[PDB]
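To close the chapter, one final illustration. This time we ask the reader to focus less on the individual chains and more on the assembly as a whole: which components sit near each other, and how the overall shape emerges from the parts.
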Amino acid sequence: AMKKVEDGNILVFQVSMKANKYQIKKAVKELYEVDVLKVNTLVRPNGTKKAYVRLTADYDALDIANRIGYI
Amino acid sequence: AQRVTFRRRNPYNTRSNKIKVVKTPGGILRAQHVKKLATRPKCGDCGSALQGISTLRPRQYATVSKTHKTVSRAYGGSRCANCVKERIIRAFLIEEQKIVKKV
Amino acid sequence: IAKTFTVDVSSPTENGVFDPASYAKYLIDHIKVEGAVGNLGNAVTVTEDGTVVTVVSTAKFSGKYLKYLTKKYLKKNQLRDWIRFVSTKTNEYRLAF
Amino acid sequence: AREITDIKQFLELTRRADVKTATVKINKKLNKAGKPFRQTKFKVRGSSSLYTLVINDAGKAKKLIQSLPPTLKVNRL
Amino acid sequence: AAQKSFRIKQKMAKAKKQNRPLPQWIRLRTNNTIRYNAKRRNWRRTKMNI
RNA sequence: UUCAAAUGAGAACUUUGAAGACUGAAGUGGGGAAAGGUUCCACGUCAACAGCAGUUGGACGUGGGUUAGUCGAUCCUAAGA
RNA sequence: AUAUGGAUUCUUCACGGUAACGUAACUGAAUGUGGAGACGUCGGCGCGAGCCCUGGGAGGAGUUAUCUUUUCUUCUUAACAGCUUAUCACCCCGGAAUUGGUUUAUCCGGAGAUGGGGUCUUAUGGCUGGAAGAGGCCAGCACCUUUGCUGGCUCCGGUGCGCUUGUGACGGCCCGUGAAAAUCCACAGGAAGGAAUAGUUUUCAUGCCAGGUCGUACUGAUAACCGCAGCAGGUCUCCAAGGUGAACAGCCUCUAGUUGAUAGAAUAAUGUAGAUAAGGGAAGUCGGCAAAAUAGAUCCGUAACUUCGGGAUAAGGAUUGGCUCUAAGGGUCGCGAUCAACUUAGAACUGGUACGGACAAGGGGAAUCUGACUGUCUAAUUAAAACAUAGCAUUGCGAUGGUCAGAAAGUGAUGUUGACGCAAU
Ligand SMILES: [Cl-]
Ligand SMILES: [Cl-]
Ligand SMILES: [Cl-]
Ligand SMILES: [Mg+2]
Ligand SMILES: [Mg+2]
Ligand SMILES: [Mg+2]
Ligand SMILES: [Mg+2]
Ligand SMILES: [Mg+2]
Ligand SMILES: [Mg+2]
Ligand SMILES: [Mg+2]
Ligand SMILES: [Mg+2]
Ligand SMILES: [Mg+2]
Ligand SMILES: [Mg+2]
Ligand SMILES: [Mg+2]
Ligand SMILES: [Mg+2]
Ligand SMILES: [Mg+2]
Ligand SMILES: [Mg+2]
Ligand SMILES: [Mg+2]
Ligand SMILES: [Mg+2]
Ligand SMILES: [Mg+2]
Ligand SMILES: [Mg+2]
Ligand SMILES: [Mg+2]
Ligand SMILES: [Zn+2]
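The assembled structure is written out below.
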């Protein structure tokens, strides 16, 4: 997941099983003050949902990731 | 000598699972799924194929222009010219005969 | 419609293990034209100047044939381990030591 | 995807208010039997389709580059 | 089985998380009698009958 | 089936190279449906299991991995319920 | 969601063509009608695609005592878009016996052939855009390294009872004539709505926004499924190279994949599996059980009997290699030129008389009992003469009915049926 942050400008999140793509996009914009290009989601084999959130070109996923605190 | 596989999860050779082998810009043979061929619209009186009407699947007629789906004449995309000709001749002759039967 | 074929033999010649005169003579007696050898009736001409080998032909000839004859001559003198027939541009070849 | 042949309709595409980029492609191609020539292809990236103008005259290709709008972004090769 | 319903996959997820040995610090508790995981399941021995 | 090297406390069985063979395109090849459910992949590791062996493994321990407006489900009706 | 451009209107809701019909567009409510969705199987023929085969040329590799202008390998083009491309069908002119046209297959013409000129469906193919910037094949340079950089070429053809597959026009067959619905379009109809200082068209072009939810790894089997298991069992389907040959047969090979099944030494008896035998030839045995013999192709020849269709590959004979030649069988162009297929027949020569040289591959005849035939059954001891079958005959019934079902019912099967039917033997 860290490679996508550095290379693909994509942030990877674990999200609620009840949330759809509309809610994930809205939550990311409000929590982090960024813009979202598209969202891809999947259900992991352990029963949790993972979302691939790609930001627009005006934003960098690397500087947002360390602003949150993880690296 | 290069062999191909289905690109969907249907493994059976049904009508909706027909394929055609093509060669890609990458230099390899790959299967291509083709849809079922369309059928020409037929005349409503004699059942013959209509001239000047595009041959498409039913839902594809909603994307093409009206000129593709009609002929500039009465009963354009419904009946052929010969059947329309018989309708006009029959309509005129019978109505004339009705007048002389009245008198 | 005569096509020109040129072979650069400077690299093996400067070492002293290759004889350009012998190579040119070998091509004269082995290029088959319209059948057997010896029918070079003003159709295939091979020249020599000590640094390059130029073959001018109007009859049936190709670069693949030229490489085929060179390899036969190369092994006849036991020189396949050091000399390789390499094409730089179209219809322009060289021997690499 | 769509090839344009008229020079007049090419110039209006470059200022259609929805075009941002264009590219110039130079191909060295041979004629029917003789020496090669320089082929220049002008591609305009529209919102829904890509328009390509192909001209085989080197002299006319130079004039079109000069008349190309400066606002439009041009990619060379 | 590649095309599976959500009910089947959800039960598959639960079985995946239960397929672990006994935590070690459990054996050190006061008055502990649990020695190993008695409900361990392996795909080669007993089927889930799901 | 054979030779050599590497690894290891330990090699007829692990790895690499060389050689000899076979499946011979209705295959011992390349994909799927039903079914199984993590067996997929990496690292660590050999008490038990692989009816010889084992440094190897579909084993053991710990983790990683399944991204769709266009592929399916979803919609339609069939025998029927 | 909506603007612009274009089109249309002061003859309000467009024009052209004799016509088939054509186009960038070129109002259409209720209601009605039609089409598409939408269909069997077999046979030969036409065409397309991929593959196979092959020539020239530009690269790389292998062999080289000798021979081999040689052996192997790379030379590719997606969805989509514009123009164009067709058997069939149709339109106009014209009016046919001295009947013509015409398919491998004999059907068509005064209900208008042949012929001349046109229109149309776009399966399909060609060119161009996509697109060489990709991918593929090589050469020359740096270099522990994050690792690249610069160069060239990627071209033009041929062939077909070939293979796989798609499709078209036809033909054979039935007491069998071989789904439904959602959904989409067209037409008929004319309710309304619209122009002159102005409106309508989102079925013409361009531009704007959004498209949720669940599945998606891997095996698919001599180890991932089911058989107590890592069991020689069982379990649906797609893709399919070269040679030999009629062949998806057997045998050998390329691509790809495996090289796994406890091993070492020795070679007694008895076994299991595979084989050969002098002379005799079923004397063996309940019984020719088992094994042997026959075997492809070409030619010659072929009985009793018969429902005339068969029997029949009846029976019984001859031939088959290699090599060098001969003859016949075509296409395309202006009697010549030129190009390209394996089919058949025949003749010399040659040999340890061998030649369907491995592989592959019918024993046959004279009669009796019995069932007509193809078909079906005792999964795990019986495949038959048993069952079924067409044919034949008998029986019941005209619906307030016959046969049968149900605890009951304002309940059911035959019956989406009607004696050329249904039901019972
Ligand atoms: Cl799964
Ligand atoms: Cl024995
Ligand atoms: Cl009888
Ligand atoms: Mg998904
Ligand atoms: Mg389906
Ligand atoms: Mg074998
Ligand atoms: Mg073999
Ligand atoms: Mg594994
Ligand atoms: Mg063991
Ligand atoms: Mg052991
Ligand atoms: Mg484990
Ligand atoms: Mg997969
Ligand atoms: Mg099992
Ligand atoms: Mg004997
Ligand atoms: Mg006896
Ligand atoms: Mg006796
Ligand atoms: Mg026997
Ligand atoms: Mg019988
Ligand atoms: Mg039969
Ligand atoms: Mg039995
Ligand atoms: Mg039996
Ligand atoms: Mg009987
Ligand atoms: Zn009609």
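Residues 20-22, 42-43, 45 of chain A lie near RNA strand G (CB under 10 Å from a C1'). The helical segments of chain A are 2-6, 21-32, 61-68. With these observations in hand, you are ready for the problems at the end of the chapter.
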